[PDB]
Amino acid sequence: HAIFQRVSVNGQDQGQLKGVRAPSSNSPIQNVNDANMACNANIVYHDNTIIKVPAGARVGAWWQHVIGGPQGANDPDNPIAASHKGPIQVYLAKVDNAATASPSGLKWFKVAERGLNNGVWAVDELIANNGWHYFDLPSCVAPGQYLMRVELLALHSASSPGGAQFYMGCAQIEVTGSGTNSGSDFVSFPGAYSANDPGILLSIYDSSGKPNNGGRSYPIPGPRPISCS
Numbered sequence: 001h002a003i004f005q006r007v008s009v010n011g012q013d014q015g016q017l018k019g020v021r022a023p024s025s026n027s028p029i030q031n032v033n034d035a036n037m038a039c040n041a042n043i044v045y046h047d048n049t050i051i052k053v054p055a056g057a058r059v060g061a062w063w064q065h066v067i068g069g070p071q072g073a074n075d076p077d078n079p080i081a082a083s084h085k086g087p088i089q090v091y092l093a094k095v096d097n098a099a100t101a102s103p104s105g106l107k108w109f110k111v112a113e114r115g116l117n118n119g120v121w122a123v124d125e126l127i128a129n130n131g132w133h134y135f136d137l138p139s140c141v142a143p144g145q146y147l148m149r150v151e152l153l154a155l156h157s158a159s160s161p162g163g164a165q166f167y168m169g170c171a172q173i174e175v176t177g178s179g180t181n182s183g184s185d186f187v188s189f190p191g192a193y194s195a196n197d198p199g200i201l202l203s204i205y206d207s208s209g210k211p212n213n214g215g216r217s218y219p220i221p222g223p224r225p226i227s228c229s
């Protein structure tokens, strides 16, 4: 359990909860067809900040166990429980106004993904970076208003149908710059994922119980991220 609550753009912190729609109370989604798979349920924090992100920028998304982080407490499950290994991905959906747009029934395209690399998951990197997930918004992304959905998929129980846990939230962004590419390989949320996808229904464990996926590659679910080639 963890909540996306803050964005950085090229190392500039945009402010706690600025432009990030967040619940205060996050259970995971475990049904890939849940209506709230886009931007999560029971949003409490929703301001009218629209974050300017240059195409090409390095974007940080901050996650903490609870809203505001531990504020000095020793939380072993901050930024997220270490057991919760999995990928982190980012999608965009174009909207007319990112402050006011509803998340339902949009067309999403993938702009970044990170999975498993030499036994290290994206979630491990998140933990190493104190809750920050970094990715590069590709330089070709067309300017305009978008919701930016950051999704963490925890696979510690994913060997059982329905056992995968999806954590997500949406930031309100305006992409600026010189890009012209609006996406190619679009999905619905819900609708992107099957519960039998091999990156959703799998054992990530070797025989000793190490969550290193046993030397197997991890097939990240969803469409391919856009390429600027």
Ligand SMILES: [Cu+2]
Pocket: 001, 002, 081, 084
């Ligand atoms: Cu959890």
